[PDB]
Design a protein around this ligand. Structure first.
Ligand SMILES: [Cl-]
Ligand SMILES: [Cl-]
Lengths: 218, 214
Protein backbone atom coordinates (compact mmCIF):
# COMPACT_ATOMS: atom_id res chain seq x y z
CA UNK A 1 0.00 0.00 0.00
CA UNK A 2 1.16 3.62 -0.68
CA UNK A 3 1.90 5.23 2.77
CA UNK A 4 1.24 9.02 2.96
CA UNK A 5 3.28 10.90 5.65
CA UNK A 6 2.19 14.51 6.45
CA UNK A 7 4.33 17.29 8.04
CA UNK A 8 3.86 19.09 10.34
CA UNK A 9 1.55 16.93 12.60
CA UNK A 10 0.19 20.29 13.96
CA UNK A 11 0.96 24.03 13.65
CA UNK A 12 -0.24 27.32 15.24
CA UNK A 13 -0.33 30.26 12.72
CA UNK A 14 -1.29 33.97 13.15
CA UNK A 15 -4.30 35.46 11.23
CA UNK A 16 -3.18 36.50 7.68
CA UNK A 17 0.12 34.47 7.69
CA UNK A 18 1.15 31.37 5.64
CA UNK A 19 0.34 27.70 6.50
CA UNK A 20 2.49 25.11 4.59
CA UNK A 21 1.47 21.39 4.85
CA UNK A 22 3.72 18.73 3.19
CA UNK A 23 2.58 15.17 2.14
CA UNK A 24 5.21 12.57 1.06
CA UNK A 25 4.27 9.20 -0.62
CA UNK A 26 6.22 5.86 -0.21
CA UNK A 27 5.76 5.31 -4.03
CA UNK A 28 5.02 7.58 -7.06
CA UNK A 29 1.34 8.74 -7.21
CA UNK A 30 1.77 9.89 -10.89
CA UNK A 31 0.40 8.18 -14.06
CA UNK A 32 0.93 9.55 -17.66
CA UNK A 33 1.99 13.10 -16.57
CA UNK A 34 -0.94 13.37 -14.04
CA UNK A 35 -0.52 13.49 -10.19
CA UNK A 36 -3.34 11.63 -8.28
CA UNK A 37 -2.80 13.48 -4.93
CA UNK A 38 -5.82 15.41 -3.48
CA UNK A 39 -6.25 17.64 -0.35
CA UNK A 40 -9.18 17.64 2.17
CA UNK A 41 -10.30 19.96 5.02
CA UNK A 42 -12.16 18.31 7.97
CA UNK A 43 -13.79 20.35 10.81
CA UNK A 44 -15.17 18.59 13.96
CA UNK A 45 -18.38 16.50 13.40
CA UNK A 46 -18.19 17.18 9.59
CA UNK A 47 -17.01 15.04 6.63
CA UNK A 48 -13.80 15.80 4.68
CA UNK A 49 -14.28 18.70 2.16
CA UNK A 50 -12.28 18.54 -1.16
CA UNK A 51 -9.93 21.60 -1.48
CA UNK A 52 -7.60 20.52 -4.35
CA UNK A 53 -7.69 17.59 -6.87
CA UNK A 54 -4.79 16.17 -8.98
CA UNK A 55 -2.10 18.12 -6.99
CA UNK A 56 -2.80 21.73 -8.27
CA UNK A 57 -6.52 22.07 -9.31
CA UNK A 58 -8.61 24.29 -6.94
CA UNK A 59 -12.15 22.78 -6.47
CA UNK A 60 -15.15 25.12 -7.21
CA UNK A 61 -16.28 27.24 -4.20
CA UNK A 62 -12.84 26.95 -2.42
CA UNK A 63 -11.10 30.36 -1.92
CA UNK A 64 -7.90 31.06 -4.01
CA UNK A 65 -5.76 31.43 -0.77
CA UNK A 66 -5.72 27.55 -0.99
CA UNK A 67 -3.19 26.23 -3.57
CA UNK A 68 -1.38 22.91 -4.22
CA UNK A 69 1.87 21.85 -5.96
CA UNK A 70 4.26 18.86 -6.21
CA UNK A 71 4.49 15.55 -8.12
CA UNK A 72 5.69 11.88 -7.81
CA UNK A 73 6.28 11.52 -3.98
CA UNK A 74 6.42 15.18 -2.72
CA UNK A 75 3.29 17.46 -2.41
CA UNK A 76 2.51 20.77 -0.58
CA UNK A 77 -0.81 22.46 0.34
CA UNK A 78 -0.32 26.24 0.98
CA UNK A 79 -2.89 28.51 2.72
CA UNK A 80 -1.30 31.89 1.78
CA UNK A 81 -3.33 34.11 4.23
CA UNK A 82 -4.82 31.95 7.06
CA UNK A 83 -8.40 33.00 8.07
CA UNK A 84 -10.23 32.08 11.34
CA UNK A 85 -12.54 29.60 9.44
CA UNK A 86 -9.46 27.62 8.11
CA UNK A 87 -8.91 25.91 11.57
CA UNK A 88 -9.32 22.16 10.78
CA UNK A 89 -7.43 18.87 10.20
CA UNK A 90 -6.02 18.71 6.60
CA UNK A 91 -5.59 15.32 4.82
CA UNK A 92 -3.73 14.33 1.62
CA UNK A 93 -5.32 11.47 -0.44
CA UNK A 94 -3.66 9.32 -3.22
CA UNK A 95 -5.91 7.59 -5.85
CA UNK A 96 -3.04 6.33 -8.12
CA UNK A 97 -2.74 2.76 -6.71
CA UNK A 98 -5.28 0.45 -4.93
CA UNK A 99 -6.12 0.75 -2.13
CA UNK A 100 -6.65 4.56 -2.06
CA UNK A 101 -4.92 5.84 1.16
CA UNK A 102 -4.89 9.06 3.28
CA UNK A 103 -2.21 10.89 5.30
CA UNK A 104 -2.28 10.90 9.14
CA UNK A 105 -3.61 14.52 9.05
CA UNK A 106 -2.26 18.02 9.98
CA UNK A 107 -4.05 20.10 12.69
CA UNK A 108 -4.06 23.89 11.89
CA UNK A 109 -4.84 26.23 14.87
CA UNK A 110 -4.90 30.08 15.04
CA UNK A 111 -2.44 31.72 17.50
CA UNK A 112 -4.38 34.86 18.70
CA UNK A 113 -4.41 37.33 21.67
CA UNK A 114 -5.13 36.12 25.27
CA UNK A 115 -8.92 36.14 26.03
CA UNK A 116 -10.40 35.67 29.56
CA UNK A 117 -13.24 33.13 30.00
CA UNK A 118 -16.74 34.45 30.83
CA UNK A 119 -17.74 32.08 33.73
CA UNK A 120 -21.34 30.82 34.33
CA UNK A 121 -22.63 28.29 36.98
CA UNK A 122 -25.86 26.21 36.60
CA UNK A 123 -27.56 24.45 39.57
CA UNK A 124 -29.18 21.01 38.91
CA UNK A 125 -32.83 21.15 37.60
CA UNK A 126 -35.71 20.15 39.98
CA UNK A 127 -36.63 17.62 37.18
CA UNK A 128 -33.21 15.85 37.58
CA UNK A 129 -33.19 15.91 41.46
CA UNK A 130 -36.40 13.72 41.52
CA UNK A 131 -34.29 11.05 39.60
CA UNK A 132 -31.82 11.01 42.61
CA UNK A 133 -28.74 12.61 40.87
CA UNK A 134 -27.46 16.24 40.98
CA UNK A 135 -25.44 17.62 37.98
CA UNK A 136 -23.82 21.08 38.67
CA UNK A 137 -22.38 22.65 35.43
CA UNK A 138 -19.62 25.36 35.24
CA UNK A 139 -19.25 26.97 31.72
CA UNK A 140 -15.96 28.74 30.71
CA UNK A 141 -16.93 30.60 27.47
CA UNK A 142 -14.72 32.11 24.66
CA UNK A 143 -11.13 32.02 26.10
CA UNK A 144 -7.58 31.77 24.63
CA UNK A 145 -5.29 29.89 25.09
CA UNK A 146 -6.76 26.34 25.67
CA UNK A 147 -5.03 25.80 29.11
CA UNK A 148 -7.53 26.36 32.01
CA UNK A 149 -8.12 25.12 35.63
CA UNK A 150 -11.66 24.63 37.09
CA UNK A 151 -11.89 23.89 40.88
CA UNK A 152 -15.25 22.78 42.42
CA UNK A 153 -15.92 23.92 46.05
CA UNK A 154 -18.86 22.54 48.17
CA UNK A 155 -19.17 24.59 51.45
CA UNK A 156 -15.54 25.74 50.64
CA UNK A 157 -14.39 22.01 50.66
CA UNK A 158 -12.43 21.51 47.38
CA UNK A 159 -13.80 18.53 45.32
CA UNK A 160 -11.85 15.64 43.66
CA UNK A 161 -12.77 12.49 41.60
CA UNK A 162 -16.45 13.63 41.03
CA UNK A 163 -16.12 16.06 38.02
CA UNK A 164 -15.55 15.64 34.23
CA UNK A 165 -14.35 18.31 31.70
CA UNK A 166 -15.12 18.81 27.96
CA UNK A 167 -13.46 21.40 25.60
CA UNK A 168 -14.67 22.55 22.13
CA UNK A 169 -12.16 22.89 19.24
CA UNK A 170 -11.21 26.46 18.18
CA UNK A 171 -14.26 28.63 17.17
CA UNK A 172 -14.36 29.37 13.38
CA UNK A 173 -15.01 33.18 13.94
CA UNK A 174 -13.10 34.38 17.10
CA UNK A 175 -10.51 31.48 17.38
CA UNK A 176 -11.39 30.87 21.11
CA UNK A 177 -12.07 27.69 23.16
CA UNK A 178 -15.06 26.99 25.47
CA UNK A 179 -15.07 24.42 28.35
CA UNK A 180 -17.85 22.80 30.47
CA UNK A 181 -17.13 21.17 33.89
CA UNK A 182 -19.89 18.91 35.41
CA UNK A 183 -19.93 18.08 39.18
CA UNK A 184 -21.97 14.84 39.84
CA UNK A 185 -23.42 14.22 43.36
CA UNK A 186 -26.20 11.94 44.71
CA UNK A 187 -29.38 13.90 45.75
CA UNK A 188 -28.51 12.90 49.40
CA UNK A 189 -24.93 14.39 49.28
CA UNK A 190 -26.23 17.45 47.29
CA UNK A 191 -28.81 18.23 50.09
CA UNK A 192 -26.12 17.87 52.89
CA UNK A 193 -24.37 21.11 51.62
CA UNK A 194 -25.44 24.76 50.81
CA UNK A 195 -22.68 26.79 48.95
CA UNK A 196 -21.72 25.50 45.42
CA UNK A 197 -18.79 27.32 43.69
CA UNK A 198 -16.53 26.79 40.61
CA UNK A 199 -13.14 28.62 40.77
CA UNK A 200 -11.62 29.40 37.28
CA UNK A 201 -7.82 30.02 36.85
CA UNK A 202 -6.66 31.27 33.37
CA UNK A 203 -3.89 33.53 31.81
CA UNK A 204 -6.58 36.11 30.82
CA UNK A 205 -7.69 36.48 34.51
CA UNK A 206 -5.34 38.53 36.81
CA UNK A 207 -6.51 36.28 39.76
CA UNK A 208 -8.79 33.16 39.87
CA UNK A 209 -12.53 34.15 39.52
CA UNK A 210 -15.31 32.26 41.46
CA UNK A 211 -19.00 31.89 40.42
CA UNK A 212 -21.33 30.35 43.11
CA UNK A 213 -24.99 29.76 44.17
CA UNK A 214 -26.80 28.72 47.40
CA UNK A 215 -28.96 25.49 47.10
CA UNK A 216 -31.83 27.69 48.52
CA UNK A 217 -31.83 29.34 45.01
CA UNK A 218 -33.87 32.61 45.55
CA UNK B 1 -26.88 20.18 -5.81
CA UNK B 2 -24.95 16.90 -5.15
CA UNK B 3 -25.99 15.27 -1.81
CA UNK B 4 -25.32 11.89 -0.13
CA UNK B 5 -26.78 10.63 3.19
CA UNK B 6 -25.69 7.51 5.16
CA UNK B 7 -28.26 5.49 7.24
CA UNK B 8 -27.12 2.93 9.86
CA UNK B 9 -28.26 1.02 12.98
CA UNK B 10 -26.09 3.00 15.51
CA UNK B 11 -25.32 -0.07 17.68
CA UNK B 12 -24.13 -3.48 16.30
CA UNK B 13 -23.36 -6.51 18.58
CA UNK B 14 -19.93 -8.23 18.17
CA UNK B 15 -19.87 -11.05 15.50
CA UNK B 16 -23.09 -9.61 13.84
CA UNK B 17 -23.35 -7.93 10.37
CA UNK B 18 -23.23 -4.10 9.90
CA UNK B 19 -25.74 -2.93 7.19
CA UNK B 20 -25.50 0.69 5.88
CA UNK B 21 -27.34 2.48 3.01
CA UNK B 22 -26.12 5.62 1.11
CA UNK B 23 -28.97 7.60 -0.62
CA UNK B 24 -27.74 10.08 -3.34
CA UNK B 25 -29.34 13.09 -5.16
CA UNK B 26 -28.20 15.68 -7.77
CA UNK B 27 -26.40 12.95 -9.84
CA UNK B 28 -26.89 9.42 -11.31
CA UNK B 29 -25.13 6.23 -10.00
CA UNK B 30 -24.89 5.22 -13.75
CA UNK B 31 -22.37 8.15 -14.21
CA UNK B 32 -20.38 8.22 -10.89
CA UNK B 33 -18.69 5.66 -8.57
CA UNK B 34 -19.49 5.69 -4.78
CA UNK B 35 -16.79 4.84 -2.14
CA UNK B 36 -17.14 3.84 1.55
CA UNK B 37 -14.56 5.44 3.95
CA UNK B 38 -14.58 5.06 7.79
CA UNK B 39 -12.95 7.16 10.57
CA UNK B 40 -12.53 5.61 14.08
CA UNK B 41 -13.13 8.39 16.70
CA UNK B 42 -10.09 10.78 16.88
CA UNK B 43 -8.21 8.71 14.18
CA UNK B 44 -7.51 8.96 10.40
CA UNK B 45 -9.48 7.91 7.26
CA UNK B 46 -9.56 4.23 6.06
CA UNK B 47 -10.97 3.34 2.59
CA UNK B 48 -13.20 0.17 2.57
CA UNK B 49 -14.28 -0.18 -1.10
CA UNK B 50 -15.99 1.37 -4.18
CA UNK B 51 -19.09 0.62 -6.32
CA UNK B 52 -18.04 1.61 -9.91
CA UNK B 53 -20.52 3.41 -12.27
CA UNK B 54 -20.74 0.17 -14.38
CA UNK B 55 -21.71 -1.90 -11.26
CA UNK B 56 -18.35 -3.68 -10.56
CA UNK B 57 -16.74 -3.56 -7.06
CA UNK B 58 -13.16 -2.93 -5.80
CA UNK B 59 -12.37 -3.68 -2.10
CA UNK B 60 -9.56 -2.98 0.42
CA UNK B 61 -7.85 -6.44 0.66
CA UNK B 62 -8.03 -6.38 4.55
CA UNK B 63 -11.93 -6.35 4.21
CA UNK B 64 -12.20 -8.76 1.11
CA UNK B 65 -13.39 -11.67 3.37
CA UNK B 66 -16.07 -9.59 5.28
CA UNK B 67 -17.23 -6.72 2.96
CA UNK B 68 -19.94 -6.53 0.22
CA UNK B 69 -20.95 -3.26 -1.55
CA UNK B 70 -24.08 -3.32 -3.82
CA UNK B 71 -26.37 -0.65 -5.40
CA UNK B 72 -29.70 0.00 -7.21
CA UNK B 73 -29.22 2.86 -9.78
CA UNK B 74 -33.06 3.28 -10.07
CA UNK B 75 -33.47 3.70 -6.21
CA UNK B 76 -30.45 6.16 -5.99
CA UNK B 77 -28.92 3.89 -3.25
CA UNK B 78 -25.58 2.13 -2.53
CA UNK B 79 -25.42 -0.48 0.29
CA UNK B 80 -22.57 -1.78 2.53
CA UNK B 81 -22.55 -5.14 4.42
CA UNK B 82 -19.63 -5.84 6.86
CA UNK B 83 -19.89 -9.30 8.57
CA UNK B 84 -18.22 -10.56 11.84
CA UNK B 85 -17.83 -7.00 13.32
CA UNK B 86 -15.49 -6.40 16.36
CA UNK B 87 -14.68 -3.21 18.43
CA UNK B 88 -12.08 -2.42 15.66
CA UNK B 89 -15.04 -1.62 13.27
CA UNK B 90 -16.35 1.22 15.57
CA UNK B 91 -16.16 4.33 13.30
CA UNK B 92 -18.05 7.12 11.48
CA UNK B 93 -18.86 5.47 8.07
CA UNK B 94 -18.91 7.86 5.06
CA UNK B 95 -20.17 7.35 1.50
CA UNK B 96 -18.47 9.62 -1.12
CA UNK B 97 -19.15 10.33 -4.83
CA UNK B 98 -15.99 9.34 -6.80
CA UNK B 99 -15.03 10.76 -10.26
CA UNK B 100 -14.67 7.45 -12.20
CA UNK B 101 -11.46 8.30 -14.24
CA UNK B 102 -9.39 10.00 -11.43
CA UNK B 103 -10.61 8.46 -8.08
CA UNK B 104 -11.27 12.02 -6.68
CA UNK B 105 -13.90 11.80 -3.87
CA UNK B 106 -15.54 15.23 -4.40
CA UNK B 107 -18.81 15.01 -2.29
CA UNK B 108 -19.17 13.20 1.11
CA UNK B 109 -22.26 12.39 3.24
CA UNK B 110 -22.51 13.78 6.84
CA UNK B 111 -21.56 10.25 8.08
CA UNK B 112 -23.17 7.64 10.40
CA UNK B 113 -21.38 6.62 13.67
CA UNK B 114 -21.42 2.78 14.15
CA UNK B 115 -20.63 1.60 17.75
CA UNK B 116 -19.74 -2.15 18.09
CA UNK B 117 -20.80 -3.02 21.68
CA UNK B 118 -22.57 -5.74 23.79
CA UNK B 119 -24.36 -2.94 25.78
CA UNK B 120 -28.05 -1.80 25.40
CA UNK B 121 -29.23 1.23 23.34
CA UNK B 122 -30.57 4.00 25.67
CA UNK B 123 -32.11 7.39 24.68
CA UNK B 124 -31.08 10.52 26.67
CA UNK B 125 -32.75 12.46 29.53
CA UNK B 126 -32.72 16.24 28.70
CA UNK B 127 -32.50 18.81 31.59
CA UNK B 128 -32.38 22.65 31.27
CA UNK B 129 -29.27 24.73 32.20
CA UNK B 130 -31.44 27.75 33.24
CA UNK B 131 -30.10 31.37 33.24
CA UNK B 132 -30.08 33.18 36.69
CA UNK B 133 -28.28 36.60 37.23
CA UNK B 134 -24.90 42.31 28.94
CA UNK B 135 -24.37 38.55 28.20
CA UNK B 136 -26.46 35.63 29.63
CA UNK B 137 -25.71 31.86 29.16
CA UNK B 138 -28.33 29.05 28.96
CA UNK B 139 -28.24 25.44 27.72
CA UNK B 140 -29.42 21.79 27.83
CA UNK B 141 -27.77 18.86 29.69
CA UNK B 142 -28.19 15.63 27.60
CA UNK B 143 -27.54 12.81 30.14
CA UNK B 144 -27.25 8.98 30.18
CA UNK B 145 -27.47 7.94 26.45
CA UNK B 146 -25.73 5.06 24.59
CA UNK B 147 -24.25 4.76 22.04
CA UNK B 148 -22.96 8.04 20.50
CA UNK B 149 -23.98 10.33 18.96
CA UNK B 150 -26.38 13.10 20.08
CA UNK B 151 -26.85 16.27 17.93
CA UNK B 152 -28.33 19.51 19.38
CA UNK B 153 -29.85 22.45 17.46
CA UNK B 154 -31.49 25.58 18.96
CA UNK B 155 -34.96 26.86 17.83
CA UNK B 156 -34.93 24.23 14.99
CA UNK B 157 -31.66 25.72 13.53
CA UNK B 158 -32.81 29.43 13.74
CA UNK B 159 -30.28 30.14 16.60
CA UNK B 160 -26.60 29.28 15.66
CA UNK B 161 -24.38 32.30 16.75
CA UNK B 162 -22.92 31.75 20.28
CA UNK B 163 -23.94 28.00 20.29
CA UNK B 164 -21.31 25.61 21.80
CA UNK B 165 -22.14 21.84 21.79
CA UNK B 166 -19.34 20.11 23.79
CA UNK B 167 -17.81 16.68 23.01
CA UNK B 168 -19.61 13.90 24.95
CA UNK B 169 -17.89 12.54 28.14
CA UNK B 170 -18.15 8.80 29.01
CA UNK B 171 -19.46 8.60 32.65
CA UNK B 172 -18.31 5.73 35.01
CA UNK B 173 -21.84 4.19 34.45
CA UNK B 174 -20.75 3.54 30.78
CA UNK B 175 -23.41 6.05 29.49
CA UNK B 176 -22.54 9.30 27.59
CA UNK B 177 -23.36 12.86 28.74
CA UNK B 178 -22.99 16.22 26.88
CA UNK B 179 -24.05 19.87 27.38
CA UNK B 180 -25.07 22.37 24.67
CA UNK B 181 -24.91 26.10 25.63
CA UNK B 182 -25.77 29.42 23.90
CA UNK B 183 -24.83 32.99 25.02
CA UNK B 184 -27.63 35.59 24.43
CA UNK B 185 -28.53 39.19 25.41
CA UNK B 186 -29.51 39.50 29.15
CA UNK B 187 -32.55 41.68 28.11
CA UNK B 188 -33.85 38.79 25.85
CA UNK B 189 -34.16 36.19 28.74
CA UNK B 190 -37.67 37.43 29.79
CA UNK B 191 -39.23 37.68 26.28
CA UNK B 192 -37.35 35.29 23.88
CA UNK B 193 -38.22 31.51 23.66
CA UNK B 194 -35.24 29.07 23.73
CA UNK B 195 -35.76 25.34 22.82
CA UNK B 196 -32.90 22.81 22.38
CA UNK B 197 -33.73 20.10 19.75
CA UNK B 198 -31.92 16.89 20.94
CA UNK B 199 -31.71 14.04 18.34
CA UNK B 200 -30.42 10.55 19.33
CA UNK B 201 -30.65 8.59 16.00
CA UNK B 202 -29.42 5.24 17.55
CA UNK B 203 -32.58 5.09 19.82
CA UNK B 204 -34.80 7.08 17.30
CA UNK B 205 -35.34 9.63 20.14
CA UNK B 206 -36.20 13.32 19.49
CA UNK B 207 -36.58 15.59 22.62
CA UNK B 208 -37.49 19.33 22.58
CA UNK B 209 -36.75 21.06 25.95
CA UNK B 210 -37.91 24.68 26.61
CA UNK B 211 -35.20 26.57 28.64
CA UNK B 212 -36.35 29.59 30.75
CA UNK B 213 -35.33 31.38 34.03
CA UNK B 214 -36.15 29.93 37.54
CL1 LIG C 1 -17.69 -1.49 -13.80
CL1 LIG D 1 -10.71 14.91 -11.45
Amino acid sequence: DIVLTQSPDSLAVSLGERATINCRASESVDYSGNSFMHWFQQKPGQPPKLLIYRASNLESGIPDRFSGSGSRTDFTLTISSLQAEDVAVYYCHQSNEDPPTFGGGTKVEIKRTVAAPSVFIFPPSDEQLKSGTASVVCLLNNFYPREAKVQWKVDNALQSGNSQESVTEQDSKDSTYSLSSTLTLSKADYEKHKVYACEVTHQGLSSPVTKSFNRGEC
Amino acid sequence: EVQLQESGPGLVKPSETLSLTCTVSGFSLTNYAVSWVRQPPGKGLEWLGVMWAGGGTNYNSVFKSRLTISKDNSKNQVSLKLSSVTAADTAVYYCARERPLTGVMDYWGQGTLVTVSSASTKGPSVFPLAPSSGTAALGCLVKDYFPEPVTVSWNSGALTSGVHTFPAVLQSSGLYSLSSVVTVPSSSLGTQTYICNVNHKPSNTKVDKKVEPK
